[PDB]
Amino acid sequence: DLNNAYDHCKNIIEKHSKTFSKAFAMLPKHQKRAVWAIYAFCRRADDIVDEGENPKEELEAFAVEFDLFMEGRLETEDPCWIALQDAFERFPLDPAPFYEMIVGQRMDLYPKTIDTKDDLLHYCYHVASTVGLMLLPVLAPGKVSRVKTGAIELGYAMQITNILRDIGEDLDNHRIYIPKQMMIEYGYTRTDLHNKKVNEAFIQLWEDLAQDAEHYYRNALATLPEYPVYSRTPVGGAAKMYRAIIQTVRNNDYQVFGNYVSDQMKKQIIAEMQ
Amino acid sequence: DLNNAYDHCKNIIEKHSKTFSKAFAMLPKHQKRAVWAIYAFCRRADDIVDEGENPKEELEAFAVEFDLFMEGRLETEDPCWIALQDAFERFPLDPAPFYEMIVGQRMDLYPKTIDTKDDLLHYCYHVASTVGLMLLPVLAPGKVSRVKTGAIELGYAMQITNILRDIGEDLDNHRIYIPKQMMIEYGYTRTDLHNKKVNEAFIQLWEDLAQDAEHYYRNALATLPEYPVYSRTPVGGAAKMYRAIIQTVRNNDYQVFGNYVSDQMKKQIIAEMQ
Numbered sequence: 001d002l003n004n005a006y007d008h009c010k011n012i013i014e015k016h017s018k019t020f021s022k023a024f025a026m027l028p029k030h031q032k033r034a035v036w037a038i039y040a041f042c043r044r045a046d047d048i049v050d051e052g053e054n055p056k057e058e059l060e061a062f063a064v065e066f067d068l069f070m071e072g073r074l075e076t077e078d079p080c081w082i083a084l085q086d087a088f089e090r091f092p093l094d095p096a097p098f099y100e101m102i103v104g105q106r107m108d109l110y111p112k113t114i115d116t117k118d119d120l121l122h123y124c125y126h127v128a129s130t131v132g133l134m135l136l137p138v139l140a141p142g143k144v145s146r147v148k149t150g151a152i153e154l155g156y157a158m159q160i161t162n163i164l165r166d167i168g169e170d171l172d173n174h175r176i177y178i179p180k181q182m183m184i185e186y187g188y189t190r191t192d193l194h195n196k197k198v199n200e201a202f203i204q205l206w207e208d209l210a211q212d213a214e215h216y217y218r219n220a221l222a223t224l225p226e227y228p229v230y231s232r233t234p235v236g237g238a239a240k241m242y243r244a245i246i247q248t249v250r251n252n253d254y255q256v257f258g259n260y261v262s263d264q265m266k267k268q269i270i271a272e273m274q
Numbered sequence: 275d276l277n278n279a280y281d282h283c284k285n286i287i288e289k290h291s292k293t294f295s296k297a298f299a300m301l302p303k304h305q306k307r308a309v310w311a312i313y314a315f316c317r318r319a320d321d322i323v324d325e326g327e328n329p330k331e332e333l334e335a336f337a338v339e340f341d342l343f344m345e346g347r348l349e350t351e352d353p354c355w356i357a358l359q360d361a362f363e364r365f366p367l368d369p370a371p372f373y374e375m376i377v378g379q380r381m382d383l384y385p386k387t388i389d390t391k392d393d394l395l396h397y398c399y400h401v402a403s404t405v406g407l408m409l410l411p412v413l414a415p416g417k418v419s420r421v422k423t424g425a426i427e428l429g430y431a432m433q434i435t436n437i438l439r440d441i442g443e444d445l446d447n448h449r450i451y452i453p454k455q456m457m458i459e460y461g462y463t464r465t466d467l468h469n470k471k472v473n474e475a476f477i478q479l480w481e482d483l484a485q486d487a488e489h490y491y492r493n494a495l496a497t498l499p500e501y502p503v504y505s506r507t508p509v510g511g512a513a514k515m516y517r518a519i520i521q522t523v524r525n526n527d528y529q530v531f532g533n534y535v536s537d538q539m540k541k542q543i544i545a546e547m548q
């Protein structure tokens with residue numbers, strides 16, 4: 001039944017994201033469950049590309065499942081698809097950003113170099129802003145057009161934050177999301193990055209991206225009054241909690257070659273939102 | 275004196291390249307010493323970018339030295355510059371490919387993705403074909419125009435060979451020279467490459483590049499009669515010796531994630547050339 005299939009998706013979000021489970025547990029019942037289902041879609045697709053043994057074939061098999069899903073002919077016992085089917089039934093979810101999300105996951109299948117900041121935003125749009133777009137009909141039922149730009153920019157904001165915390169982790173998987181033009185601008189070589197060096201040039205480049213993330217966070221938060229009241233604390237809380245990763249890395253002297261917002265800090269952000 | 279400064283450059287080539295020291299020891303005295311000096315220039319610049327701690331600044335300091343060298347005002351005790359200065363005095367060396375070589379070394383300073391085969395040839399031209407061009411006035415004094423295309427293609431041939439043997443070694447330094455379009459064409463993912471997988475798709479892609487190298491080797495060898503007699507065995511020998519790396523990897527079942535032409539095989543190639 002629906003409660004079991006949603007409970008499965010609740011287990012996924014609570015296992016993989018402390019920040020987003022605590023934010024979204026504050027939504028009303030049916031919005032919260034739909035976000036759980038939307039989350040499990042995103043998290044499966046990202047796990048295929050980033051952690052599956054055969055990512056080209058697994059993701060293509062995942063997208064075919066979604067084509068069948070969207071045509072209402074996917075018949076299965078998989079709780080995530082049963083939860084998503086109700087969510088799509090219960091709220092006017094748009095499939096466009098769901099597809100766009102898969103197009104973004106495709107980008108991580110083969111070697112790519114981010115050259116410019118726009119390259120970076122293009123990537124961030126497809127793997128993170130799309131998720132913002134998937135959620136808006138649940139979060140802002142009648143006001144999607146009024147809040148869409150801020151949702152997109154909140155996407156940029158959090159993906160850059162995640163990239164900025166995961167520099168070493170991404171290097172060890174032979175991924176670089178730092179724009180090459182910035183590395184040239186600040187004199188931070190690939191040899192420097194290979195030697196996991198935190199010098200003044202690295203900090204300059206990190207801070208330049210971090211301030212971009214911060215402007216986007218600010219834009220997104222400026223749209224929070226346009227959300228319905230029940231969405232303001234979960235959306236605002238999730239943003240501030242994730243934004244707090246940046247300052248965490250600052251207080252740890254930018255050591256991103258070995259970072260969590262603390263549980264207590266997370267609660268402080270929530271309480272301030274309340 | 276000159277004999278000491280050339281003897282220093284002889285020590286460099288014999289330490290770093292079995293293939294090219296044995297080929298070029300067969301040249302007459304003054305051609306052989308000049309090749310030694312030309313070799314030490316190339317090998318210093320490549321060592322800066324690939325093994326220096328501060329490659330942006332070291333290579334720029336190396337290029338400034340060469341600007342001063344070319345204006346005849348570099349005064350030093352460094353044997354490699356004293357050997358190169360005679361070589362430039364003794365033979366009509368062109369500085370154009372020497373500069374182009376540094377432009378090619380610049381490319382390895384920051385993250386880059388080879389997208390297409392032309393990307394690859396562009397890179398190979400600047401780091402390997404230029405070396406062919408540096409050598410031609412010593413190897414083919416009056417016939418540079420007649421043999422230049424083959425020298426360039428011999429460049430392509432050997433750089434691809436080197437890339438093709440060094441796939442794992444280059445991966446561990448966070449370098450990928452495989453064109454991304456080929457990985458897409460043959461279904462060889464970045465995850466596959468990260469898992470150092472030698473599957474049928476990897477072999478298909480490897481063999482496609484290997485046949486390109488082989489066509490270029492064939493073109494270059496077809497120009498060998500246009501070289502003067504004393505250059506035919508060293509140029510032909512060096513090419514066949516380096517080309518033999520490809521078949522070596524074939525006989526080792528393409529295991530390039532852990533390959534040498536044997537000493538005895540090297541001698542067989544030389545004797546056949548003689």
Ligand SMILES: CC(C)=CCC/C(C)=C/CSP(=O)(O)OP(=O)(O)O
Pocket residue numbers: 020038039040042043044046050127131135162166
């Ligand atoms: C679906 C919602 C609301 C949030 C999660 C979206 C999702 C699946 C993010 C993948 S997070 P993660 O693997 O930590 O980040 P990346 O390295 O893939 O860029």
Ligand SMILES: CC(C)=CCC/C(C)=C/CSP(=O)(O)OP(=O)(O)O
Pocket residue numbers: 016017018019020128129131132135139151154155158159162235238
């Ligand atoms: C919540 C709203 C309004 C927009 C969300 C934008 C968003 C959730 C981008 C992905 S955050 P990510 O770090 O990728 O996912 P987790 O580490 O929390 O698992």
Ligand SMILES: CC(C)=CCC/C(C)=C/CSP(=O)(O)OP(=O)(O)O
Pocket residue numbers: 294312313314316317318320324401405409436440
């Ligand atoms: C100067 C002559 C005739 C041959 C040597 C040219 C030279 C310095 C090649 C560098 S070889 P190597 O480091 O093994 O090859 P790459 O990985 O740099 O592409």
Ligand SMILES: CC(C)=CCC/C(C)=C/CSP(=O)(O)OP(=O)(O)O
Pocket residue numbers: 290291292293294402403405406409413425428429432433436509512
């Ligand atoms: C000898 C002629 C005519 C053209 C030479 C083209 C050439 C030497 C390209 C570099 S071979 P490389 O593998 O880079 O250098 P080593 O491993 O032998 O040190």
Ligand SMILES: [Mg+2]
Pocket residue numbers: 046049050108
């Ligand atoms: Mg991902």
Ligand SMILES: [Mg+2]
Pocket residue numbers: 046050
């Ligand atoms: Mg990921």
Ligand SMILES: [Mg+2]
Pocket residue numbers: 162163166
């Ligand atoms: Mg990450």
Ligand SMILES: [Mg+2]
Pocket residue numbers: 320323324382
């Ligand atoms: Mg090199």
Ligand SMILES: [Mg+2]
Pocket residue numbers: 320324
């Ligand atoms: Mg090298």
Ligand SMILES: [Mg+2]
Pocket residue numbers: 436437440
């Ligand atoms: Mg190599």
